[PDB]
From Swiss-Prot, chain B:
GO terms for molecular function: RNA binding; structural constituent of ribosome. It comes from Mycolicibacterium smegmatis (strain ATCC 700084 / mc(2)155) (Mycobacterium smegmatis). Keywords: Ribonucleoprotein, Ribosomal protein. Signal peptide: none annotated. The lineage of its organism: Bacteria, Bacillati, Actinomycetota, Actinomycetes, Mycobacteriales. This is Small ribosomal subunit protein uS9. The chain holds residues 25 to 150 of 150 of the full protein.
From Swiss-Prot, chain C:
Keywords: Ribonucleoprotein, Ribosomal protein. It comes from Mycolicibacterium smegmatis (strain ATCC 700084 / mc(2)155) (Mycobacterium smegmatis). This is Small ribosomal subunit protein uS10. The keyword Ribonucleoprotein applies. The gene is rpsJ. GO terms for molecular function: structural constituent of ribosome; tRNA binding.
Curated annotation (Swiss-Prot), chain D:
GO terms for cellular component: cytosolic small ribosomal subunit. Binds the lower part of the 30S subunit head. Binds mRNA in the 70S ribosome, positioning it for translation. GO terms for biological process: translation. Binds 2-aminothiazole antibiotics, which are antitubercular agents. This is Small ribosomal subunit protein uS3. Residues 37-105 form the KH type-2 domain.
UniProtKB/Swiss-Prot annotation, chain F:
One of the primary rRNA binding proteins, it binds directly to 16S rRNA where it nucleates assembly of the head domain of the 30S subunit. Is located at the subunit interface close to the decoding center, probably blocks exit of the E-site tRNA. Keywords: Ribonucleoprotein, Ribosomal protein, RNA-binding, rRNA-binding, tRNA-binding. This is Small ribosomal subunit protein uS7. PROSITE patterns: RIBOSOMAL_S7. The lineage of its organism: Bacteria, Bacillati, Actinomycetota, Actinomycetes, Mycobacteriales. InterPro entries: Ribosomal_uS7 (IPR000235), Ribosomal_uS7_bac/org-type (IPR005717), Ribosomal_uS7_CS (IPR020606), Ribosomal_uS7_dom (IPR023798), Ribosomal_uS7_dom_sf (IPR036823).
RNA sequence: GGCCUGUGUGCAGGUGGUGCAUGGCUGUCGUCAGCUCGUGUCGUGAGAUGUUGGGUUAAGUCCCGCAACGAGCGCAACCCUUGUCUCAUGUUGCCAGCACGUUAUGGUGGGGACUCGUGAGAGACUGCCGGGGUCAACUCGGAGGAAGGUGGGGAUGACGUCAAGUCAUCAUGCCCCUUAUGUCCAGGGCUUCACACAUGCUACAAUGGCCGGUACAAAGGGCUGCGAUGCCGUGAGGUGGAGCGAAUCCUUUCAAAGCCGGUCUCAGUUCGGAUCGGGGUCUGCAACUCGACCCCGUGAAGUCGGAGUCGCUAGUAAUCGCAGAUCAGCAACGCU
């Protein structure tokens, strides 16, 4: 769903968000729900839906993330300054009405088309797959 | 036997609802020597009006606590409850009338900073 | 029969309850007749004050030093059972009226 | 006057008394006796910190327990101090003195003792940040210390204005009744005038 | 209503020469001049008598009744004259404003 | 009620007559909790009217109410340097209520030596079209006529 | 050695001042919903964002969004009380079914039956039916239920201001006194009064005043204290002490407004009670200054009140009475 303001910069606080995700999942697994109010358990369900739609990547990151890849450039320019601040090589298929020459490794393409975007997501998926396979 | 209760602001009365006449006993006297007030009589009789059972069920009860109005309200409550115990089917036309709710309008604690519960002193701005 | 009447006083219901149970256990030992903890009402002593000095009488504070109470009518006074009951030591929030 | 004693607010519910008995007619007497007791305690020992003073009465005997983390400084190794106090107890009419001294486990988790240590540090010569902050850390490092607050008042370093600023970390839910709390107070010597201290410690919650 | 201005002269603990009374009654007549709605004028003349004071020796509280809205003027100075005049000018602001908003 | 109103109280029916305006009447003439005194006064007065007219007093009562009950009244407003009175229509609830208030408060200042008599004669007078209640109601209509000009406000 | 006789000595004491030197303690805006931090970015910097926008809320309560992610004191809830109900329950209290006294009467044996008292505990949660709603919050109608939608009332006072108040509750930093601002005493005053202000009570009458007869409440207090039985005194009260450390006894088997009956007939009165002259009672060593009560006589001003103004939304307001404490005895109409 959503981009958080300040993942890559303030990584150690979203780390605590993962820790609370773990705590809440532990509560769910152990099964203590009527130990506290039904309304509060329903609000925990709200918390969990929100936290899961807004966070999946840290659940396996843990590990000083590299500023490699880009999601929806023009509308989340806020995701790039979080990256280039630290300066690591950035890549996205160009959102094609933008400042092209910020990014170390630009790649033209489209901004909207479902088909071209799924294609090139499969391309970079393939790149990662070959890198891991011949590791 | 039949034995049930009603309560309205410190007005407790126990009731024995006999199947007899409409003869009422209130600690050795009747509904006109005790309660010489036709409004209280109406409140007390209205369940009999409701089920159309005036002069079908005698009563023996004890006055205890409260004043006349609280006593009357607790009485008709207890009588309604006895009628539910005699037969439930009159119930859905009673809560319809609210001859069953134990009137939760009790006295308020007299608070401080005042003359009584809510009447403050005359607030001058002097 | 012969009767003995013990009227207990205290401030904490937890203590009056615990002591009543222990005492009735000791009564139960020698087969002496028990009536049990018949609840009397509570006292409510109240002493209103003012919070602050020199003025501000509109501000107040209430307090209430209750005193829970219990009667435990004991019958069949076997004097051996009396010798048993007289000499139990209990929590100090309780005082007793053996009569 | 904003905030009442948490002890006095939760007294019959969560926390508990500190002088337990029952009495119908000896009541004034027990009260004047007990104030004289606590006064003579403070006057008989001050180098150490009395956390609490608590125990009870019966038909005849008059027992006490008492808390302090340093009883070694207090009691007669051979019996000096305890004997002086049993004599003080004879003088003010105890006559059966079961002075049964005790000590705490975590002096840092004790409100009164932390405040007394802080005020000691202040009356020595010392400034405010390291004393305050180091007491805070000393408490917070311990397991049950789930929250804390400090509210000092007095004329720190920073001439005449009665300034007061607080420090805290954790949780301090003082309108919440299932909470356990510990209050801590002090009012004694200092050059310019008095220094006052208040302390709050939070120690889990209670369900029962 | 002309002597109906209920003069209330007073001082908790001050050496109050009785010509200060002349001053006060005259300075209050001065606003009788342009407000014909007046019932009560409770007035004080207070003194904090602290050592090494904070520049503000004497103090004054003034309050006045009008038809409904009451007026309030507080002041502070070293002595009687600045106190009188300053509270007077504050009342003048109040009353100019009140008779501007009255209509 | 910046958030909204609340319900009205459920008037009882009369034990004797079969009309809740009578319990409304005793509760409007009441003074210092003496509800039974109000009751006995009213019942005595209505039976006085019964012996005065040979019929039920309730019909002449409601006829008096038809005489003295307006459906139009005043509601002021401060506007532009001169406060303006305005006609406003009156729902029947407050119409009956204010009519009864008129009735009592202009009954009290009569000279029948006794409230029961003052009240009974006032009711008869209003059924006939003479009471000061009727007079004040006519004054109200007079005012509404004098100030029809301000109806376009519609307020 | 206890003790004091004194000698002085350290001194001891101050209600002497500064609450603007201070601690504590409290009132307040306000029980109004806000107040802030970490890390984060923006900005030269003060600082900002978060806490802004849309809906909803008792409400920074919650949801849909975004350079913010979160978090703490808060609001809410866990506390008591009241509100319904189940289990246990039996005296000092209920006492039906029973029996026995029968004028004073639950009075006594007898039954835990209804109450009941005290303890534990389910029960209300938009929990459920339906209609609206980003289908989200949330709200509109329904069922049951005793209560229905923060059931009601309390308690609980965020950071902080107001140099608010309190050096006289207390404690305290400074300066002053010490043969006296200290200290022990008898008398007097803090109750003065040509006036102004503020809070209240009873009145200005027939929904009333007077006389007589009859009924139902909860609540607390009581030992060198509470106090009736019988009688005398007009009645205040008077010897007397049963009986009670107390659901027992005093607290009438706990009242008054009220119900019924008779008179008064709109008035400066059978209103109203002040003020004053008498004669007495009680507590206290002591009632002039300066006490309360009673009886007698006295019988005033006052005929619903100006401008403007205070309070109150439910057992609330308005009214009648009672009780408690501080108390030797009383200004208590006050306070709770």
């Amino acid at each position: 769903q959503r981009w958080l303001g300040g993942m890559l910069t303030n990584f150690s606080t979203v780390h605590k968000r993962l820790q609370r995700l773990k705590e809440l999942e532990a509560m769910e697994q152990t099964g203590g729900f009527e130990g506290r109010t039904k309304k509060e358990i329903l609000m925990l369900t709200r918390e969990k839906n929100k936290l899961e739609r807004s966070l999946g990547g840290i659940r396996d990151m843990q590990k000083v993330p590299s500023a490699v890849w880009v999601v929806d450039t023009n509308k989340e320019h806020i995701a790039v300054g979080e990256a280039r601040k630290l300066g690591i090589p950035v890549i996205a298929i160009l959102d094609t009405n933008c400042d092209p020459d910020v990014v170390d490794y630009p790649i033209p393409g489209n901004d909207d088309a479902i088909r071209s975007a799924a294609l090139l997501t499969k391309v970079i998926a393939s790149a990662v797959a070959e890198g891991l396979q011949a590791r | 036997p039949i034995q049930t209760v009603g309560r309205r602001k410190e007005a407790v009365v126990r009731v024995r609802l006999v199947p007899g006449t409409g003869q009422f006993n209130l600690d050795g006297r009747t509904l006109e020597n005790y309660f010489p007030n036709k409004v209280h009589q109406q409140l007390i009789k209205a369940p009999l009006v409701t089920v159309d059972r005036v002069d079908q069920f005698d009563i023996y009860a004890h006055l205890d606590g409260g004043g006349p109005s609280g006593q009357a309200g607790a009485l008709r409550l207890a009588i309604a409850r006895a009628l539910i115990l005699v037969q439930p089917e009159d119930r859905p036309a009673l809560k319809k009338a609210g001859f069953l709710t134990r009137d939760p309008r009790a006295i308020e604690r007299k608070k401080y900073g005042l003359k009584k519960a809510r009447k403050a002193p005359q607030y001058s701005k002097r | 029969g012969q009767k003995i009447r013990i009227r207990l006083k205290a401030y904490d219901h937890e203590a009056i309850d615990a002591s009543a149970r222990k005492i009735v256990e000791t009564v139960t030992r020698t087969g002496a007749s028990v009536v049990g903890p018949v609840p009397l009402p509570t006292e409510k002593n109240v002493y209103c004050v003012i919070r602050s000095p020199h003025k501000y009488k509109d501000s107040r504070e209430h307090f209430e030093m209750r005193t829970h109470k219990r009667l435990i009518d004991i019958l069949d006074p076997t004097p051996k059972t009396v010798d048993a009951l007289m000499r139990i030591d209990l929590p100090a929030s309780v005082d007793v009226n053996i009569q | 006057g904003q905030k009442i004693n948490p002890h006095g607010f939760r007294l019959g519910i969560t926390t508990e008394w500190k002088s337990r008995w029952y009495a119908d007619k000896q009541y004034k007497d027990y009260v004047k006796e007990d104030v004289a007791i606590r006064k003579l305690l403070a006057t008989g020992l001050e180098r150490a910190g009395i956390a609490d003073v608590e125990i009870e009465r019966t038909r005849d005997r008059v027992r006490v327990d008492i808390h302090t983390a340093r009883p070694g400084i207090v009691i007669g190794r051979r019996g000096t101090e305890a004997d002086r106090i049993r004599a003080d107890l004879e003088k003010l009419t105890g006559k059966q003195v079961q002075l049964n001294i005790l000590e705490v486990k975590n002096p840092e988790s004790q409100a009164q003792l932390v405040a007394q240590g802080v005020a000691e540090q202040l009356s020595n010569r010392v400034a405010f940040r390291r004393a305050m902050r180091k007491a805070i850390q000393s408490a917070m490092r311990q397991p049950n210390v789930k929250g804390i607050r400090v509210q000092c008042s007095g004329r720190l370093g920073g001439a005449e204005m009665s300034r007061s600023e607080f420090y805290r970390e954790g949780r301090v839910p003082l309108h919440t009744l299932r909470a356990d709390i510990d209050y801590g107070l002090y009012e004694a010597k200092t050059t310019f005038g008095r220094i006052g201290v208040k302390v709050w410690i939070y120690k889990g919650d209670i369900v029962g | 209503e002309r002597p109906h201005a209920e003069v209330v002269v007073k001082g908790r603990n001050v050496e109050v020469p009785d010509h200060f009374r002349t001053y006060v009654s005259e300075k209050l007549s001065r606003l009788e001049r342009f407000d014909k709605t007046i019932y009560l004028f409770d007035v004080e003349l207070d003194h904090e008598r602290n050592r090494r004071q904070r520049k503000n020796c004497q103090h004054v509280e003034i309050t006045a009744r009008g038809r409904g809205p009451v007026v309030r003027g507080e002041a502070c100075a070293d002595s009687f004259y600045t106190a009188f005049e300053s509270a007077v000018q504050k009342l003048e602001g109040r009353l100019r404003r009140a008779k501007d908003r009255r209509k | 009620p910046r958030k909204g109103p609340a319900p009205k109280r459920p008037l009882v029916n009369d034990p004797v007559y079969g009309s809740q305006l009578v319990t409304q009447l005793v509760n409007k003439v009441l003074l210092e909790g003496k509800k039974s005194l109000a009751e006995r006064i009213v019942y005595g007065a209505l039976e006085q009217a019964r012996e005065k007219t040979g019929t039920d007093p309730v019909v002449t009562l409601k006829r008096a109410l038809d005489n003295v009950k307006p459906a139009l009244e005043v509601r002021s407003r401060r506007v532009g340097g001169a406060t303006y009175q305005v006609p406003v229509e009156v729902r029947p609830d407050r119409s009956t209520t204010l009519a009864l208030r008129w009735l009592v408060n202009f009954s009290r200042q009569r000279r029948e030596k006794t409230m029961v008599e003052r009240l009974a004669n006032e009711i008869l007078d209003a059924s006939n079209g003479l009471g000061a209640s009727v007079k004040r109601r006519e004054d109200t209509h007079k005012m509404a006529e004098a100030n029809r000009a301000f109806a376009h406000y519609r307020w």
